[PDB]
Amino acid sequence: LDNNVVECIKEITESSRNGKLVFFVGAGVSTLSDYPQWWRLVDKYHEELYGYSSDEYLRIPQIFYNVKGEMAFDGILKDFFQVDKPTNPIHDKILAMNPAHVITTNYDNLIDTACWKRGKYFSVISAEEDVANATSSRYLLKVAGDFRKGFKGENVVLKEDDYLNYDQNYPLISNLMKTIIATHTIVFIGYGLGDYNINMLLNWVRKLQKDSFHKPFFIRTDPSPIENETLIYYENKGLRIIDAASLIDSNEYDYLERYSAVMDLLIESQE
Amino acid sequence: LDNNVVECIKEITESSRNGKLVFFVGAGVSTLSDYPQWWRLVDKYHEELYGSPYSSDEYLRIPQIFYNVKGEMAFDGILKDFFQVDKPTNPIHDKILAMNPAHVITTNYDNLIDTACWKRGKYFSVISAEEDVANATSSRYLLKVAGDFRKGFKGENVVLKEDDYLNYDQNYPLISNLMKTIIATHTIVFIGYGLGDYNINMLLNWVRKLQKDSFHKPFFIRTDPSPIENETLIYYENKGLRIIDAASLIDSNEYDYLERYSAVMDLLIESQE
Amino acid sequence: DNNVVECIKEITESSRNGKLVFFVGAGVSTLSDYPQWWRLVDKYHEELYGSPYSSDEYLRIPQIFYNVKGEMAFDGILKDFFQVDKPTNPIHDKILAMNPAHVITTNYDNLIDTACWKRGKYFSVISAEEDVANATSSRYLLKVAGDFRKGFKGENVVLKEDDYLNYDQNYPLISNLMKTIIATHTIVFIGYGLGDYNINMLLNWVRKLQKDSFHKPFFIRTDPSPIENETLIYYENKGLRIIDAASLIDSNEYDYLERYSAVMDLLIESQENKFITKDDEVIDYIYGKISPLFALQYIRKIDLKHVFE
Amino acid sequence: LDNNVVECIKEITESSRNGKLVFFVGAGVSTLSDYPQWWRLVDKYHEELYGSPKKGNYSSDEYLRIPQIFYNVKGEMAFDGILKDFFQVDKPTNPIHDKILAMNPAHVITTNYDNLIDTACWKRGKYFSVISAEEDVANATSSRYLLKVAGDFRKGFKGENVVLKEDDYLNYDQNYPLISNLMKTIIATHTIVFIGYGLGDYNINMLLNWVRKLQKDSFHKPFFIRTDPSPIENETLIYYENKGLRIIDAASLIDSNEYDYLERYSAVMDLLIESKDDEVIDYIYGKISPLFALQYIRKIDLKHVFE
């Protein structure tokens, strides 16, 4: 173990005990259930266009929409995202932490089904109107939309145009997410350090005063242990990183093992 | 109060019982209990710069002009001498607290609502400064969007000058986000606020940015003597505001402001709890 | 005094080089007896509440009327006031006599355009978004508050609250052009109130600029009473150089053309040799004019007339 | 040649003859002079940081961040030292710079921090006021600007007076308010022709995003000279042509080799710089029609009319 790791685990458990822990779950948690990873859809759109760079993830969907209409866009999106994948152990592991809120950029319903299975009831907030009608005290925030109003591309923010207008298209959802981040303890699971959402959140946290907020915990479970340079870089940007690969030596492709190891370490520390 | 008022009271009481009620207490309420209204301070500031003495832009500029010209020290001096006189909490404060509001949002810097909250036994975690937002110890917040003098009687703690309002969104990101979230997720009742108030109008613009029927239109208690002109009422109602007119509610003289406030407060409290 | 003398010197030096831009306010239009805004605001208030301000009220009352009585009523009430024509006053002639590089005006009238046509200098007028892209001439008459050229509707002009709220979004090209002209050219404000909405917005934008990276605009104040010193410091530290017409000449408050005429006569008449009285400044001026000619072996005697203008 | 390129050339030459042509010179023109490509700088930064060069290509986010990570991790001094090592060299100006200058553009907008464009302008005896810093906008020394929107190395080879890292681009609108607004004004009031830029470039993406906010059919679509190795796809062409661009594909016209960029640039450039008994009467009438407004015309003035 490590003194930094033990301190982070203790802080996480302490915040979970008093109901302050909030889980920011990325696509890494949803790929455990073998849900279509975004590069699958990007590659399908690219192949449709002409028979992965980060900017391409937003460009390819954008060009495909602009050319093949909302018609082809929603057609492909519904085709690839109607699988009904089963929830992985990590979903229930996240739920066992008893998080106050679960912010997920994912559009798949794995997380809410996991909450229902555990019995925890989270008011799902994935649309502008959902904020006003949120009855439950605990919010499950889908800050990228979800396929519960249908399988149209308007529901989600997959393409680059939605990302560009997200601030003015999701003012209530955006400000609620910022409030949750500011007033809670945030743990990032299933997110790459280069993710668009992670970088945008890090840019936002710059505007905050030096000691105004709490540095969110980042749980990295990529196969390759991070370089010291990246750890130092993202430590000064407000991210507190716990490296699954560094914590335990494991197989490169055994992402499930890394996620589960970090999660059971947290749970066992919480008792 | 046939329809446009009875329905407002019914919705307010329903939200209060549900617990999704928040009060945006204006400066006027803190003036019901004798207190220095900001126009008096603006007059004093102008008299310091000039011989004798108001537009809202002048409201923001005259203290700003004093701060720029005279300096931080003198500005803080008049601020402290004028705003350091303790005052007794009026019946309006405990009347507001009796509704059991979830949170209390106010643009006042005085300790006249926290005192009422403590005296009534209800604990609201006061959030007046930037750093107080994250280190919150209670579910319910008494958010002073304009700051307060708890840390000290310096003018930097509060936003009252033109520059303070110019950089408010940059100066108070967390506080502004928290207030916006509270407004969006709770039913908001505005009390002791000028219909053309600066803070009210900025929030009205923010709500205009919001999409159609994506939020609940806040309530606004209007307490100055003159009954609301129909055109102004229509304009503000279409601006996402539901106006409860204290002047139309009862019959009273212009200068008896306590009676006009109490009419609305009692009609809201006693009527179906 | 030295301050006003230096202000006039800078203004004239910028004008002679073609780097002078004039920010014409509503006072210049009022000098031509054009209907001031407060008249129309009073008309709107009377129509709204039956029987009849501030920066907020000026924007609100027209805004209230727009959505309470409708677009057509707003357009009709504003056209019945602004459709009347007026003759350009001597102040427009004085403004154009400086050969300004550009004229930026928030007025919705055509008096400045008519004066530009009179003088013979073709100022391509930009009062709409499409105007910026297709403006053949290099001299811009920027109507930053719209114009009635297209029609007499209220949409073409910026005079109501929502119009000002979405100005940056509604007029991106026009705002960018005005800011570029302000940053590049020397700016003189005439016909504007010190506590004005447009001037305050320009000051707010200038605050964002890096220190000493821009030139402080000149503001010609024609208010009836001499400006308070405290306000003078406040506005000169905000990025303004104030030339007070009331201070230069004492005139009765009711009349305003005399103050504008005094300021503009000081501008036009002023010459670099007008201020040189010390015999140590005579040599300074002569050397400033003759020094670059030292690089030439011989200078034609008759050609020297060009050196001394 | 094709008809679309014919229309584009017609409009570009017309605008240039009116003194309304501006050239947005990209990094490809500088690379034509064998100037250190930014990808090589990013590779050096990555090698210094992680001890080995990155496997594969670099994304735009990588270009923006690897320099930023090195700057805040390895310190400012090393960040400027790498820039001094790679950029302090002086490279000859390629024929493309002189070709661009031969069009006598009203202004020259370039994100390059090198002085190659300035050297070409002087070699052609052109007086361009180089506005590379914030203070330069107010004190312009000439009518036509060589506006370097990404800064330049005139005031030393420090990385502060350049837009290279992620923070420089993030705070550009606040770091360069005057320069950004002047560039936008020049774009709005002039005819812009892009050279040496890729469709995936960050600067072009930002400019296209800004052009979104403009009013419908308010601005003029800027021309974009595309000279990437491969021919332009029919999907990206439509995508970027309704995004405000006027793409002119070099590979589409010239059936040239790959990695032979110089001639590919030159084809478009010299197709740009090289410019019946029923049209003769039309031309003469076009020249003489305004003269009908005058009672009498001097014959020598007629010589004047016919250039």
Ligand SMILES: NC(=O)c1ccc[n+]([C@@H]2O[C@H](COP(=O)([O-])OP(=O)(O)OC[C@H]3O[C@@H](n4cnc5c(N)ncnc54)[C@H](O)[C@@H]3O)[C@@H](O)[C@H]2O)c1
């Ligand atoms: N990025 C691409 O376009 C691309 C193309 C081919 C393969 N990949 C694969 O994706 C990974 C990196 O990029 P990405 O955006 O697709 O993922 P990422 O690593 O960028 O994605 C986010 C999260 O994904 C998790 N993850 C990645 N692969 C996983 C797996 N097999 N099982 C469980 N979790 C997994 C990591 O936990 C990471 O935090 C690499 O593992 C790579 O082999 C990516």
Ligand SMILES: NC(=O)c1ccc[n+]([C@@H]2O[C@H](COP(=O)([O-])OP(=O)(O)OC[C@H]3O[C@@H](n4cnc5c(N)ncnc54)[C@H](O)[C@@H]3O)[C@@H](O)[C@H]2O)c1
């Ligand atoms: N110099 C001035 O601006 C001026 C002119 C006339 C009256 N006043 C006094 O200032 C306020 C004028 O109305 P106003 O809306 O500008 O107020 P205000 O806007 O200055 O602030 C107070 C708000 O609270 C309520 N309020 C009004 N008068 C009050 C009073 N005397 N005691 C307690 N609460 C009051 C009103 O709803 C008012 O909007 C009153 O207090 C009035 O007696 C001031």
Ligand SMILES: NC(=O)c1ccc[n+]([C@@H]2O[C@H](COP(=O)([O-])OP(=O)(O)OC[C@H]3O[C@@H](n4cnc5c(N)ncnc54)[C@H](O)[C@@H]3O)[C@@H](O)[C@H]2O)c1
């Ligand atoms: N304050 C009001 O809203 C209101 C209402 C009715 C009438 N008025 C009259 O108008 C004047 C205020 O004018 P404003 O709204 O333009 O604010 P203003 O007085 O601030 O505008 C000032 C610019 O307009 C100029 N100006 C004022 N009167 C002028 C005149 N007769 N001729 C030429 N220029 C003049 C001054 O030049 C000044 O620099 C008041 O002093 C009053 O006489 C004002």
Ligand SMILES: NC(=O)c1ccc[n+]([C@@H]2O[C@H](COP(=O)([O-])OP(=O)(O)OC[C@H]3O[C@@H](n4cnc5c(N)ncnc54)[C@H](O)[C@@H]3O)[C@@H](O)[C@H]2O)c1
């Ligand atoms: N991603 C990388 O950095 C990487 C790695 C290895 C090789 N390369 C090669 O280096 C090139 C650098 O371009 P970029 O990817 O940095 O942007 P890019 O290739 O999109 O930029 C190309 C634009 O710049 C110009 N350009 C590119 N390469 C040129 C060349 N070799 N000669 C003349 N002009 C050229 C072209 O006009 C083109 O439109 C790549 O296009 C590729 O050929 C790049």
